[PDB]
Amino acid sequence: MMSGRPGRVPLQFLPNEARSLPPPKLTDPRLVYMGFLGYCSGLIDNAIRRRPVVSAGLHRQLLYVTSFVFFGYYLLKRQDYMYALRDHDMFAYVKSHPEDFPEKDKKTYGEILEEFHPVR
């Protein structure tokens, strides 16, 4: 699309302006889903290595969950950052082009004339 927006410093995962947004809440439904992946990401690890799937190396499953929820958290913060930034210049652009977004006058359904299609 942002690509080369006027100010995007390259290779900046979380630009300093992203902190002005509400950070993701610690028990975020999307974030805990990333935690779900971490549990799964260790679940096969016992499976493909031929180990007791439910209980074999709880540390590996613990590490898998812990890593995912962090990288998910930083991904989530940027995700909200871009979407807010996507909408931001969108909100400013329409006022930058007032004549080009002329919100129409509202005529109630009393005067609107739309034909009707009987069923038979």
Which parts of this chain interact with ligand 3PE (CB under 6 A)? 52-54
- Residue 42, CA distances (Å) to 3, 5, 28, 54, 62 in order: 35, 39, 21, 10, 8
For the bound state, the minimum distance from the C-beta of residue 19 to another protein, rounded and expressed in Å, comes to: 16
Instruction: Kindly list the residues in this chain that would bind another protein in the complex (CB under 8 A).
Output: 1-3, 30, 33-34, 37, 40-42, 44-45, 47-52, 54-59, 64, 75, 78-79, 82-83, 86, 110-111, 113-115, 117, 119-120
Closest to another protein by CB, 36 vs 92, is: 36
Interatomic CA distance for residues 7 and 37, integer angstroms: 35
Cα first-last separation, the chain: 49
Closest to ligand 3PE by CB, 9 vs 48, is: 48
Phi, psi of 90 (to 5 degrees): -65, -45
Interatomic CA distance for residues 95 and 46, integer angstroms: 57
Closest to ligand 3PE by CB, 13 vs 39, is: 39
Residue 49 binding partner per list ligand 3PE, another protein, none, with a CB distance cut-off of 5 to 8 Å that depends on partner kind: another protein
- The one-letter code for the residue type at 46 is N
Residue 26 binding partner per list another protein, ligand 3PE, none, with a CB distance cut-off of 5 to 8 Å that depends on partner kind: none
